[PDB]
UniProtKB/Swiss-Prot annotation, chain A:
Protein name: ATPase family gene 2 protein homolog B
Tissue-by-tissue expression: Expressed in both neurons and glia during embryonic and adult stages of brain development.
MF terms in GO: ATP binding; ATP hydrolysis activity; identical protein binding; polyubiquitin modification-dependent protein binding; preribosome binding
Alphabetized UniProt keyword annotations: Acetylation, ATP-binding, Cytoplasm, Cytoskeleton, Deafness, Epilepsy, Hydrolase, Intellectual disability, Non-syndromic deafness, Nucleotide-binding, Nucleus, Repeat, Ribosome biogenesis
Name of the gene: AFG2B
UniProt disease link: Deafness, autosomal recessive, 119: A form of non-syndromic deafness characterized by mild to profound sensorineural hearing loss. Sensorineural hearing loss results from damage to the neural receptors of the inner ear, the nerve pathways to the brain, or the area of the brain that receives sound information. Neurodevelopmental disorder with hearing loss and spasticity: An autosomal recessive neurodevelopmental disorder characterized by hearing loss, global developmental delay, impaired intellectual development, hypotonia, spastic-dystonic cerebral palsy, focal or generalized epilepsy, and microcephaly.
Major localisation: cytoplasm
Function according to Swiss-Prot or TrEMBL: ATP-dependent chaperone part of the 55LCC heterohexameric ATPase complex which is chromatin-associated and promotes replisome proteostasis to maintain replication fork progression and genome stability. Required for replication fork progression, sister chromatid cohesion, and chromosome stability. The ATPase activity is specifically enhanced by replication fork DNA and is coupled to cysteine protease-dependent cleavage of replisome substrates in response to replication fork damage.
Keyword Iron-sulfur among UniProt keywords: no
One biological process term in Gene Ontology: ribosomal large subunit biogenesis
Required for interaction with AFG2A and CINP: annotated segments: 1-178
Subcellular location: Cytoplasm; Cytoplasm, Cytoskeleton, Spindle; Nucleus
GO cellular component terms listed in the entry, alphabetical order: cytoplasm; cytosol; nucleus; spindle; VCP-NPL4-UFD1 AAA ATPase complex
Assembly information from the UniProt record: Part of the 55LCC heterohexameric ATPase complex composed at least of AIRIM, AFG2A, AFG2B and CINP. Associates with pre-60S ribosomal particles.
Length: 183, 527
């Protein structure tokens, strides 16, 4: 078929999920809260969580680009472009034993240095709870989020999270710290 | 890319790699160098693109924050924003190869005598830089238009002292920058870029960008069908020339063959100016003297500037001249700083030749108007101060680069005697108007390309051209050639002998033969 792309009201805009009408939900048959790899029409895929439309409506797709493709974030808003259903994909999600990240920090301008790794590690482990992420992606932090972290460029994934993978509450989070392919 | 600016670019890249490329030596020898530079000049296609290019030439964080994009409404947010950006700079100094840059700090930097909050701003930025004094690998590049537009209390020693102007738009640079601009836009394949360049005196690079821009604008608005492949025709560039004016603002080479008469003065100038440069070791083994200052004078109207330029040509030495029009800007206190900068470039290209033309215009009457001649005597003072600064060393391997200053004029009394005094200038040579033979020679050489023919005999004019000037003879033969042309019409190659005489009785020369005696006697009593 063909789907419009409305903007995203505030409530969802906070979190990760992407809404969708029961038509396409019946189409790709994902129960709920699943992963859906979405390929923006501007280059750079994206990943979001499924949740039904509020009013049994049809043919529209609101989505939020939390687990984006690097730099291609804003390309998700400010449009009226269509989105064909084939541009969406159901992706399996494994429990992803251990992960490894390289974080930017928020500009707490006034005190950098040695960064009390327990703090940043706790904040990151928080921001990664129960989310599905797919390797090679930024994970922005929601506005007014707590703590210090503001990015989780995803690099190390133990059971090879190339399609995607679910970070579980019992997963080591190695703050490796290798900024990859900066050009 | 870089357009007609790689010279200052290279110079500044040197001055900045000096601290940056070797930080582990200053404290290693207690040698804190200058940290902070001032790029003054019309910005746009140049200065900021240049600082980009050079930070790249070394590898540095192009933190190109336009300073007027951080202004605040309430006192306290401003200086804290300054704290913020300079903290970014410091935590950058924690890194490797880097550089801090900003632009248009002038809006963020008025001059002294202003109100209170400027004091807060300047003191706290001085604080941030005096703290960064201990930083590792960052400096400040204040990028503005004119250095005066800033606060003086920020250009102190150990403060913003390394002050460099952007380039002045020379023809070669003009062509370079036109090529650089059009390197991304289709202009026709029939462009003599240097033509428009020389048509654009005063027009800085960005002005030329604008010129080509509006040119293409009316090209699009004028082209009708193939509005995708603009063959932007130079006629529209002329159109642009019309609809534009430049801002406020002797490369011409010459030769001795272009001048004759008064061979004595030529041989003199050869003796006591160029030969020290061409035979310095010979001079010092002779050890005779180096006369540091020379003055020249005759009747006004012998194109003496030409002889000066010929001297400047026969040596290859970096030559710079100074004129009143080059000097008389509407800024009081600017003449002093200008001549200072000129002598500063002199000592920069230390084997240099500096020349003050029409010093009567450079310095007017002494006390003719006994109440409104203060800044002129101030220029006199600062000049005298810079003059005896040419006192070199190494009395009797022989490296001694001084700048033998020469000036010339015709009004002797209008100057100040202390200048002529043997403490500063001890060589004053006379340029009398040519004799019969000099007039003969000048006629021959000015005519060596004019339309001539069979009935020419210059000796008669020579007999009749007494009490003339060189310019007199030149204007005479020019207007006469005009007559010859218009008489037989455009298609003509003949010559004449008499319309010169008619032009003579039209153009009346300085026939007095007395004012020359006045100037000569006065000068001879002045030295």
């Amino acid at each position: 078929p063909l789907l419009k792309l409305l903007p995203l009201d505030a409530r969802d805009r906070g979190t990760q999920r992407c809404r969708l009408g029961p038509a396409a939900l019946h189409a790709l048959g994902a129960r709920l809260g699943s992963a859906v790899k979405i390929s923006l029409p501007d280059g750079g895929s994206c990943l979001c969580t499924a949740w039904p439309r509020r009013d049994g409506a049809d043919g529209f797709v609101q989505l939020d680009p939390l687990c984006a493709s690097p730099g291609a974030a804003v390309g998700a808003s400010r449009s009226r472009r269509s989105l064909s259903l084939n541009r969406l994909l159901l992706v399996p999600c494994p429990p992803l034993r251990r992960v490894a990240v390289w974080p930017v920090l928020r500009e707490r301008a006034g005190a950098p240095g040695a960064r009390n790794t327990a703090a940043v590690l706790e904040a990151a482990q928080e921001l990664l709870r129960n989310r599905p992420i797919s390797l090679g992606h930024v994970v922005v932090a929601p506005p007014g989020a707590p703590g210090l972290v503001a990015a989780l460029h995803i690099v190390g994934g133990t059971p090879s999270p190339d399609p995607a993978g679910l970070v579980t509450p019992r997963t080591r989070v190695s703050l490796g710290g290798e900024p990859p392919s900066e050009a | 890319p870089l357009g007609g600016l790689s010279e200052a670019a290279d110079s500044l890249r040197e001055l900045l790699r000096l601290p940056l490329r070797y930080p582990r030596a200053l404290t290693a020898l207690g040698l804190a160098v200058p940290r902070g530079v001032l790029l003054a000049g019309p910005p746009g296609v140049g200065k900021t693109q240049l600082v980009r290019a050079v930070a790249r030439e070394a590898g540095a964080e192009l933190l190109a924050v336009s300073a007027p994009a951080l202004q605040g409404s309430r006192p306290g947010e401003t200086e804290e924003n300054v704290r913020r950006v300079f903290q970014r700079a410091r935590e950058l100094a924690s890194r490797g190869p880097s550089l801090l840059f900003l632009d248009e700090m002038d809006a963020l930097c008025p001059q002294r005598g202003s109100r209170a909050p400027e004091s807060r701003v300047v003191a706290q930025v001085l604080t941030l830089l005096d703290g960064a004094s201990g930083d590792r690998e960052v400096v400040v590049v204040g990028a503005t238009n004119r250095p005066d537009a800033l606060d003086p209390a920020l250009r102190r020693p150990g403060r913003f002292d390394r002050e460099v102007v952007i380039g002045t738009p020379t023809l070669k640079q003009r062509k370079e920058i036109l090529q650089v601009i059009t390197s991304k836009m289709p202009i026709s394949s029939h462009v003599d870029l240097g033509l428009l360049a020389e048509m654009t005196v005063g027009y800085v690079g960005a002005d030329l960008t604008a010129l080509c821009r509006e040119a293409a604008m009316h090209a699009l608005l004028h082209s009708e069908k193939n509005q995708d492949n603009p063959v932007i025709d130079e006629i529209d560039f002329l159109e642009a020339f019309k609809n534009i004016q430049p801002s406020s603002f002797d490369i011409k080479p010459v030769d001795w063959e272009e001048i004759g008469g008064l061979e004595d003065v030529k041989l003199k100038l050869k003796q006591s100016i160029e030969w020290p440069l061409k035979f310095p070791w010979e001079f010092v083994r002779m050890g005779l003297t180096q006369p540091k200052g020379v003055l020249l004078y005759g009747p006004p109207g012998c194109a003496k500037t030409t002889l000066v330029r010929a001297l400047a040509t026969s040596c290859h030495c970096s030559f710079v001249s100074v004129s009143g029009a080059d000097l008389f800007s509407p800024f009081v206190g600017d003449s002093e700083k200008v001549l200072s900068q000129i002598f500063r470039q002199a000592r920069a290209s230390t084997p240099a030749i500096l020349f003050l033309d029409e010093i009567d215009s450079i310095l007017g009457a002494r006390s003719a108007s006994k109440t409104g001649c203060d800044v002129q005597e101030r220029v006199l003072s600062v000049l005298l101060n810079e003059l005896d600064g040419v006192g070199l060393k190494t009395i009797e391997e022989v490296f001694n680069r001084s700048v033998m200053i020469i000036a010339a004029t015709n009004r002797p009394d209008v100057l100040d005697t202390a200048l002529l005094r043997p403490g500063r200038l001890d060589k004053i040579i006379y340029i009398p108007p040519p004799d019969h033979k000099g007039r003969l020679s000048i006629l021959k050489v000015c005519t060596k390309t004019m339309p001539i023919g069979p009935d020419v005999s210059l000796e008669n004019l020579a007999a009749e051209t007494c009490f003339f000037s060189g310019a007199d003879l030149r204007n005479l033969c020019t207007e006469a050639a005009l007559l010859a042309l218009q008489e037989n019409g455009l298609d003509a190659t003949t010559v004449k002998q008499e319309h010169f005489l008619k032009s003579l009785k039209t153009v009346k020369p300085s026939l007095s033969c007395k004012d020359l005696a006045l100037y000569e006697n006065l000068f001879k009593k002045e030295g």
